[model samples]
Target: MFFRLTRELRDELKRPLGELVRGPIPEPYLKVRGELEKHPVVTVGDVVTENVLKIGVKPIIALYDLKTKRKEYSPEIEDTAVFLTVTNPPGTITKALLDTVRKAFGLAERGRNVHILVSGEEDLAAIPAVLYAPLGTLVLYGQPDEGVVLIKVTPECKRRCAKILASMEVVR
Candidate 1:
């Protein structure tokens, strides 16, 4: 199943032969995700915005383990999504994403953990498939770079995880 999704994602992310993976391609995520062989590994510094929230300029990593036989269009839906982060390295990016997926989601490995989608899924088209995994709401994003966790400590992203934690604590 993972191989199938891997193949599917690769097909979706296919490039023309000999075409360098750079420049404006609508979603520059594959470039930052480090799927292109010639492309440099992207950091938070790479994602330039007028606001530039200063999420820090390091890589992010995350891990996940398979807990059960992976679902294959089961009638039952779940409430937890296996999450991990993908390394921004060589090989196929789609394969990279599948490789990052936990075996519970049909990945090859049983206890594999990836650092890709933990904090964000730049390729949001994958959301529907992920939703099928029944991942919990208020899910956490995983980033391999430690810099983000450091910065996320005090301030906040467009949304604030720490503030929510604190606010919930106050109510308790």
Candidate 2:
């Protein structure tokens, strides 16, 4: 049993809720890479990780489900020192997912580069990613048909995510 999003709350979270970084990916890649040099960058989608890897920047933690835009595809990224997988249905966060999110940060603290391959939708994984990352870690995910959305972890950022998650009802 864990937190499952009610329909209304699920729809609300689908919105692109971060600082908008629009344009083709080269510009975004540069910005993300710069952040990587200073802080851990946790990527939440396959395409974002693909683009970063193309640009020669490997994210500290990449959460992917091997699909993008609901279309299945192969994911090509560097082999991580550690790999983990979890299943979280759309709009739901199981305890397994939540615990792994925390453990990803713990792995990073211990100097391990971790990659998480999800069996279900990982869009909302960014929520826990932002919650668990150290302050200033950059969380990046795609904005669907638009561009990338970058969220910097801060005290306020954690507070905001906690507020949103707290609003969701837990499920079994």
Candidate 3:
């Protein structure tokens, strides 16, 4: 799936959508793991996932594209979650990506963990992760040169996603 990103939205996406914490996140994750409820934890990048795993935490939904810090790379992560792949180009959110997020949350409701192995890029997947995640769910994603972004999914977060999505042009 693909969408045409207008100039305005592209710039907004370039900006951080969530709060950024500097450096790796294992310690913070260890402390936050207890605070994370059953609502589900979602991660959008490899480093974020690895950090969570290191802290003995597992997200209900983890999306990875096999690349980190703008370099070709792969990190060995646990294989316990149900794996799936979707085509999500770098700049826009595809229907496939949205559908996958919805389905993953559905499976999470059924007590299954979901791992999305992205074919293109998983950077923007955090947008949909927060949009579809249930309230209290924690969505984590990387901020490139910065650190990981941790967003607690709430009604306000979904509303924010809806507002931004409204201005996007969907191309299937």
Candidate 4:
């Protein structure tokens, strides 16, 4: 299954899905170090993943498209991570992407860090991250020109994410 974004929901999603950590890279992450230590982290976006890794916190699952602000970019992460790739076009979430995320979480449970490189876009991967992550997992994604948005996964948060996903058009 695939979920396609509708034009009407564009502005809605532009708003941060969770707490907005305004300011520079490492600073935002530093402020949340205490919380990060207690829970699994799932990072979406190249810059966010890069910053998290730079801070020496290896997220259980990190998703990136190798592009930031529509420009080519790559985050330096450990070569030991289990890397996987999927295709998720901009504005839509493909089944492959969701499945890969589930797989990554499984691998993480086995004490392995997983990095998923998206062939199209990884922006919306945050939604699925929240949906499938175990409760209390920290889901981080960048807010362009602002900062990173940190989402703490909970039952309520999962319900909200499911609502958003349900609103998307299902590809036939």
Candidate 5:
């Protein structure tokens, strides 16, 4: 029986929260900045090329093309580069999810992107998907003491979901 943002993760978040309340900047975005700063990474300057994965933690937003290992200090939403923030109660990379993502983007390609969030008294059912996966959902709930697991919508499932979507649409 596990929960998202266990006590320690919540505590870690508080540091940035406090920093924001204390900082001179209005809307310091401390949580966002702190998450980015504390990223367990493998950068070009750093010594490692291996991947870094963490438990009970969400991923930080990436700002560049990791493949080419290039980065910039500006936002490029539509660029080949992508920024991702991992979620807890992580959305499963399943076919249903991929269909949802493709529909939202009106894309010809398959596959979907998903995220998770837990809030409000340790209960997860209340959270909502962002602008990304706005319609379709695969939600499950568990007792307060029982562990609840959610998998990210997989690449294969996403592609299938997209195929389903294309089948329903009028082709050119």
Candidate 6:
């Protein structure tokens, strides 16, 4: 199944799905290093993923599109991780992307970090990441010029993501 963004849902998604951390890059994460150690980390943007790695926290799964603000950019990631690529358009989440996320989680369970290099946009990948992530997983994503948003996966967060996903137009 594929989910496409709609006009009405745009504003709703602009709101942060979790706590907003504002400060220097990766420093915010460093402050709460102890708490972060307690959960599996999942980063959804290039800069955020890079910063997390710089802080020595290896996310179980990291998704990046090689672009920041629609401009080409590359983050330094470990070559040892299992890499997967999927095509996800600007505002839609493709089935391939969803499946890859599931597969990444599976690999994570086996003690491997999976890096999903999205061919298109990865802006909305956090939705599926939250839906499939186990409870207590830390789902982090960049909030443009603001800061990083950290969402702790829980039953309520999953339900909220499902509701938003349901509102999207299904193209397949």
Q: For each candidate in the order shown, give its overall lDDT on alpha carbons.
A: 0.26, 0.79, 0.76, 0.86, 0.25, 0.85
Against the true structure, whose lDDT is highest? 4
Worst 10 residues of 5 by lDDT: 44-53
lDDT of 2 by residue, 37-123 (tens): 787788888888777666666677989884444222225433335788888887787788889989988988998877788988888
Q: What TM-score, computed on C-alpha atoms, does each candidate reach?
A: 0.19, 0.86, 0.83, 0.91, 0.18, 0.90
For model 2, the run of ten residues with the poorest summed lDDT: 70-79
lDDT of 1 by residue, 1-172 (tens): 1122244444543422112333432233333333323221111222321001122211222222122122122121122223444432222123345444323244313333222332223332122123223222112222222211111111122134222222321110
What lDDT is reached at residue 75 by model 2? Answer: 50
> Residue 86 of model 4: what lDDT?
92
Which model is ahead, 5 or 6, in terms of TM-score?
Answer: 6
Model 2 misplaced regions, further than 4 Å: 66-80
Q: Which stretches of candidate 1 lie over 4 Å from their true place?
A: 1-87, 90-93, 102-132, 135-137, 142-172
Any runs in candidate 4 off by more than 4 Å, and if so which? 66-79
- The count of backbone overlaps in candidate 4 is 0
How would you encode candidate 4's per-residue C-alpha lDDT over 15-98 as one tens digit per residue? 999999887666888988788889999989888887887677878998988444422223544456788889888899899988
List where candidate 5 sits over 4 angstroms from the true fold. 1-28, 40-75, 82-94, 98-172
Per-residue lDDT of model 6, residues 108-128, tens digit only = 889888888898899899999
Candidate 5 structure, TM-score to reference: 0.18
lDDT of 1 at 163: 27
Q: Which residue pairs show collisions in model 2?
A: none
Clashing residue pair totals per candidate (backbone < 3 A): 20, 0, 0, 0, 12, 0
Looking at candidate 1, the ten consecutive residues that score lowest on lDDT are 146-155
